[PDB]
Design a protein around this ligand. Structure first.
Ligand SMILES: Nc1ncnc2c1ncn2[C@@H]1O[C@H](COP(=O)(O)OP(=O)(O)OP(=O)(O)O)[C@@H](O)[C@H]1O
Length: 240
């Protein structure tokens, strides 16, 4: 099935350890849009993405991918279905060079031209990466590694690209380039679910946003409108 809503979370509840991390949230990520989930550290952003990816259990509610209930399915299955996740930590394989890291992303495509066009498309998106194609990973700057992690996910031609704090700890200029690349990716049609602590940057590129506070959504709406909301501005953008 193919839906206009690529991902829908319904009354999701997540419990682990001693804490009730997510307390019944609802979210929708429309096809071709960039949706962002923002909130302070510890709001439950990573947990939300983990639940969706099946890395943590959903005690209540459901996660629907293109109309199909994938609630609590095996993480490896959910990945094969088309949901790509670029977790926090710019996880990359340092022992493999930039080229190998990108290519391992298209391990299940069988494509011939597509893989070709996609590899070159990623080159225009990340000039600095092509500048160090034969170079190993772990020898690039965190900024470059972050860009490499994103490139790898792209080579799998994701039906849904999820990213957890893509700009965390980066220099202003890199933060700016991260968000610009996210926009370029979306302009090609890729649906994105972006989790960020940098609310300003996230809301500026997103179509829709959700504000998560202590496991619950307190506000949601068109991104441009959230930027003009007094509560968002004072609480997340520093305008008090
Ligand atoms: N030892 C603990 N004591 C209290 N709360 C804890 C503990 N360990 C984990 N948590 C819970 O973890 C949740 C925060 O982690 P989560 O991964 O959801 O954060 P996040 O806001 O997405 O940040 P990041 O994206 O950086 O991981 C909170 O609900 C917090 O209460």
């Amino acid at each position: 099935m193919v839906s206009d809503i690529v991902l829908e979370v319904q009354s999701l509840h997540v419990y682990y350890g001693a804490i009730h991390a997510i307390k019944g949230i609802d979210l929708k990520v429309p096809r071709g849009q960039i949706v962002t989930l923002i909130g302070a550290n510890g709001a439950g952003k990573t947990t939300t993405l983990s639940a969706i990816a099946g890395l943590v259990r959903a005690q209540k509610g459901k996660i629907i991918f293109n109309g199909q209930d994938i609630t609590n399915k095996p993480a490896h299955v959910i990945n094969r279905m088309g949901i790509a996740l670029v977790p926090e930590g710019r996880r990359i394989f340092p022992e493999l060079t930039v080229y190998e890291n990108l290519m391992m992303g298209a391990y299940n495509r069988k494509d011939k031209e597509g893989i070709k066009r996609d590899l070159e498309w990623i080159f225009s998106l990340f000039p600095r990466l092509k500048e160090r194609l034969k170079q190993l990973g772990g020898t690039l700057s965190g900024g470059e590694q972050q860009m490499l992690a994103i490139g790898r996910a792209l080579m799998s031609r994701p039906k849904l690209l999820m990213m957890d704090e893509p700009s965390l700890g980066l220099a202003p200029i890199l933060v700016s380039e991260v968000f610009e690349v996210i926009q370029k990716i979306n302009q090609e049609g890729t649906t994105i679910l972006l989790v960020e602590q940098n609310a300003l940057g996230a809301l500026k590129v997103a179509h829709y946003g959700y504000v998560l506070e202590t496991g619950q959504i307190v506000l949601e709406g068109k991104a441009s409108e959230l930027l003009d909301n007094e509560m968002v501005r004072k609480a997340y953008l520093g305008v008090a």
